[PDB]
Write an enzyme that holds these catalytic residues in place. Structure first.
Site, PDB file in Angstrom:
ATOM      1  CG  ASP A 180      -2.506  -0.102   0.963  1.00  0.00           C
ATOM      2  OD1 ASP A 180      -2.535  -1.348   0.003  1.00  0.00           O
ATOM      3  OD2 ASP A 180      -3.314  -0.226   1.634  1.00  0.00           O
ATOM      4  CB  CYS A 214      -1.086   0.505 -11.512  1.00  0.00           C
ATOM      5  SG  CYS A 214      -0.310   2.022 -11.944  1.00  0.00           S
ATOM      6  NE  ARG A 220       1.283   0.389  -6.805  1.00  0.00           N
ATOM      7  CZ  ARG A 220       0.406   0.287  -5.949  1.00  0.00           C
ATOM      8  NH1 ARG A 220      -0.663  -0.937  -6.755  1.00  0.00           N
ATOM      9  NH2 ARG A 220       0.228   1.042  -4.744  1.00  0.00           N
ATOM     10  CB  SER A 221       1.434   1.483 -15.293  1.00  0.00           C
ATOM     11  OG  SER A 221       0.469   0.667 -14.835  1.00  0.00           O
ATOM     12  CD  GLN A 261       2.217   8.349  -9.218  1.00  0.00           C
ATOM     13  OE1 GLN A 261       2.233   7.424  -9.312  1.00  0.00           O
ATOM     14  NE2 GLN A 261       0.887   9.376  -9.445  1.00  0.00           N
TER      15      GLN A 261
END
Ligand SMILES: [Mg+2]
Length: 284
Positions: A180, A214, A220-221, A261
């Site tokens: 998370d 994602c 994440r992508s 990110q």
């Protein structure tokens, strides 16, 4: 050598600084279609939009818009579609895009609920006998089989175009253990997942581009595509240490904003490529 680059940044604790240079150097192109008022409810996040020049267009006349971008990595011979997690009202658009683009695989890097909030609609069926029908785009989706492993799940889905009665098999690769908060401590399970996607044929040029998402389709992508392309370029080139993570990342950011990110995701991307290199330099 990037293994050396990594030590120097890590010893200096300058990840946040590296990350900022990337941010300031990254491309900016118009996103006029994404910001039209008629598309406000097709975007999960106000600040994450596809550039006009690389956006995927639905074969619709009313509204061709979906929050998705084509990343084309010419030297690597790899193409990816990066998209947001579908919204309750864009699940039909999502599967329309998979159909129209002839994709073989969907890579999902998030859970439906994270941090107590919904990050993605439930856009595939959870039981064989309860198929899903998307009335707006005339598609039927059936769960054929589901293989649940410790770090990821692989599903075989049947997508049927109700108009033509054609059917296609789609593979759904779902990485279920991204934390998370932060990034995985080890890239081992992420790399194992990446190689399972590769082994399936989903990344291969005989098929349309893989769909990767994602929640926003940038963090994440981005890590997934960056690691895959860097590892492929180190296989292709006469000099594998000519592969620079920052250069590849800036090239991908010409096609979708914001890829990677956080500085922690950048560090993780380095770690994954460094560790993955050990396997592609030949450990049969
Ligand atoms: Mg059952």
């Amino acid at each position: 050598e990037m293994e050396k680059e990594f030590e120097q940044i890590d010893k200096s604790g300058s990840w946040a600084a590296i990350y900022q240079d990337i941010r300031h150097e990254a491309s900016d192109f118009p996103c006029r279609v994404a910001k039209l008022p008629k598309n406000k409810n097709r975007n999960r996040y106000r600040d994450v939009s596809p550039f006009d020049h690389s956006r995927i267009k639905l074969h619709q006349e009313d509204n061709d818009y979906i929050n998705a971008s084509l990343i084309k990595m010419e030297e690597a011979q790899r193409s990816y579609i990066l998209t947001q997690g579908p919204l309750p009202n864009t699940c039909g658009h999502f599967w329309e895009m998979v159909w129209e683009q002839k994709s073989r695989g969907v890579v999902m890097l998030n859970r439906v609920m994270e941090k107590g909030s919904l990050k993605c609609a439930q856009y595939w069926p959870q039981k064989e006998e309860k198929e899903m029908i998307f009335e707006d785009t005339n598609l039927k989706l059936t769960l054929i089989s589901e293989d649940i492993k410790s770090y990821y799940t692989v599903r075989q889905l049947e997508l049927e175009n109700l108009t033509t009665q054609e059917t296609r098999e789609i593979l759904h690769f779902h990485y279920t253990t991204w934390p998370d908060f932060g990034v995985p401590e080890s890239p081992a399970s992420f790399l194992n997942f990446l190689f399972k996607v590769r082994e399936s044929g989903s990344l291969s040029p005989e098929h349309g581009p893989v769909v990767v998402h994602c929640s926003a389709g940038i963090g994440r992508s981005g890590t997934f595509c960056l690691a895959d392309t860097c590892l492929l370029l180190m296989d292709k080139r006469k000099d594998p240490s000519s592969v620079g993570i920052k250069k590849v990342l800036l090239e991908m950011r010409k096609f979708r904003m914001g890829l990677i990110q956080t500085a922690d995701q950048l560090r993780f991307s380095y770690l994954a490529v460094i560790e993955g290199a050990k396997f592609i330099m030949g450990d049969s």
